[PDB]
Amino acid sequence: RDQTSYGDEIDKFWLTQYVIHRESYDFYSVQVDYTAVGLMSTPNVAESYQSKFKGRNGLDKVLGDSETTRVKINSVILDKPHGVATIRFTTVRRVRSNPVDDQPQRWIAIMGYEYKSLAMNAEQRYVNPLGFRVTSYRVNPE
Amino acid sequence: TRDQTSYGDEIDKFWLTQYVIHRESYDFYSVQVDYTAVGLMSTPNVAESYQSKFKGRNGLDKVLGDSETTRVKINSVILDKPHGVATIRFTTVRRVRSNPVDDQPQRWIAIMGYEYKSLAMNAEQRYVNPLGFRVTSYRVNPE
């Protein structure tokens, strides 16, 4: 169904799922994450994101399993009538060669989002059943 | 609650910045609250100059609706407490909902006259303007 929002708790779920999928890096799940971000984006948002994964120096082809970045959501502020969200989160990167994790980094994600009923199939349905999608996405430091 | 020109730097600065934020912002979802607030915090002369733009078929909220929004950033406040005069430098960022980006920032100077007046007040005004703060003159110019 086409609706801008599904309520505070549902919106926060898909939005945090989006940031977790897009801003994390783990080689063992990057294909799933990449796929998810693709389904949860407008083609403009998606193709701006998929750029990073193309060419000989695509992110996963450069990094491999050398490092990881995990995400911690700190807060989510919703503007449900306009499909706008501001999400503060923290990244902790870890290079497998190093013995310790790197120092945490804090970010702000300003997001536009919406729900669209579109032609969907079973494996996509199993990922994005409500047809959630991000319509704009920008990250800046805190 | 009392006829006073000033209440001290920190309190004066609070009401003055609140006034500018209420008056120079535009948000359809809060415009009724902002409009009410400016009215309670103004002398009738200052008020009816402000309420003018909201009157008629082409009242600001009737024309703009929720099509666009304008947010305020206070940059600096200079107080002249004995004379109830303040200078406030602020920045507005307008955003048209049809556009993908915000407009470019605009910088302004607000020269304000202010005072506090105990007047006959009700519960709803008391919850908004408890000290009877009011702006006695108001003019904005670009920077």
The range of the structural domain enclosing residue B92 comes to 1-143
Which one-letter DSSP state was computed for residue A99? S
Q: How distant is the Cα of B97 from the closest Cα of chain A, in angstroms?
A: 9
Closest C-alpha among A138, A16, A23, A6 to residue A74: A16
Burial class (CB in 10 A: 0-12, 13-18, 19+), B140: middle
Q: Who's near B73: CB < 8 A, 6+ residues apart?
A: B90, B91, B92, B93, B105
The values of phi and psi at residue B78, to 5°, are: -115, 120
Report the domain count for chain B.
1
Does the CA dihedral B124-B126-B132-B134 come out positive or negative? Answer: negative
Tokens of B67: 């099509």
Q: What is the CATH number of the domain that holds B43?
A: 3.10.450.230
Strand order in the sheet with B133-142: B68-80, B85-96, B106-116, B133-142
Q: What is the CA radius of gyration of chain B?
A: 16
Q: How far apart are CA A14 and CA A36, in angstroms?
A: 11
Please give the C-alpha separations between residue A9 and each of A6, B22, B52, in angstroms, as whole numbers: 8, 30, 42
Whether A72 and chain B come into contact, CB under 8 Å, resolves to: no
- Mutation test of the interface with chain B: which of A82, A111, A135, choosing the one with the most B Cβ atoms within 10 A? A82
The one-letter amino acid at A110: I
Q: Which helix (H) or strand (E) holds B110?
A: strand B106-116
Resolution number, Å: 2.4
Which one-letter DSSP state was computed for residue B68? E
Whether B29 and chain A come into contact, CB under 8 Å, resolves to: yes
Closest residue in A to B69 (Cα) is A82
- Do A136 and B100 make contact, defined as CB atoms within 8 angstroms? yes
- What technique solved it? X-ray
Q: Who's near A108: CB < 8 A, 6+ residues apart?
A: A86, A87, A88, A139, A140, A141, A142
Please give the C-alpha separations between residue B119 and each of A114, B1, B42, in angstroms, as whole numbers: 49, 7, 12
Query: Can you name the residues that pair with B134 across neighbouring β-strands?
Result: B115
Q: Which helix (H) or strand (E) holds B72?
A: strand B68-80
Whether A135 and chain B come into contact, CB under 8 Å, resolves to: no
